[PDB]
Design a protein around this ligand. Structure first.
Ligand SMILES: CCc1sc2ncnc(N[C@H](Cc3ccccc3)C(=O)O)c2c1-c1ccccc1C
Length: 150
């Protein structure tokens, strides 16, 4: 159907869920498994890095967005389009968008709003793939991401 979308959702949804709960998903990765695994290993290193290095900036943004429920998560979409989509495009901003997803997902787990983590992952994947389709394709998608951060 749309392999780039499917693979993107798989990687982003797994990272966000693993960050929120601490459990690594052992259910085998779907089509192009070698790439999705390396992509997720890359996020574990670079994404954990951005969250640790920029905790204060991440925390201040979470505080502005005041996420309390499903409604607040739905309104993050408009913000991500304005903040992410309207800026320059590059793997460093893509990793920042996804890392901030993880930081929000951990927040959702603490406040007993885990049911919002899957929707969040879908919203981030939709923002990324809908708005950066041609750039992702030109940069060889998730193979490119993995090669970029080696
Ligand atoms: C809605 C929140 C989002 S989505 C997003 N996507 C890409 N980059 C972001 N941020 C980087 C700056 C940057 C780099 C590293 C750490 C912190 C902040 C960019 O704008 O270059 C952002 C931000 C965002 C914007 C401002 C403050 C905090 C965040 C999370």
């Amino acid at each position: 159907e749309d392999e780039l979308y499917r693979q993107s959702l798989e990687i982003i949804s797994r990272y966000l869920r693993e960050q929120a709960t601490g459990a690594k998903d052992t259910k085998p990765m779907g089509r192009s498994g070698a790439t999705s695994r390396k992509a997720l290993e890359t996020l574990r290193r670079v994404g954990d890095g951005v969250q640790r290095n920029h905790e204060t900036a991440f925390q201040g943004m979470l505080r502005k967005l005041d996420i309390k429920n499903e409604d607040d998560v739905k309104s993050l979409s408009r913000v991500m389009i304005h903040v992410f989509s309207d800026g320059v495009t590059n793997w460093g901003r893509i990793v920042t968008l996804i890392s901030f997803g993880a930081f929000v997902a951990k927040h959702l787990k603490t406040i007993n709003q885990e049911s919002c983590i899957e929707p969040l992952a879908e919203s981030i994947t939709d923002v990324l793939v809908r708005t950066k389709r041609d750039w992702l394709v030109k940069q060889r998608g998730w193979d490119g991401f993995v090669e970029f951060f080696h």
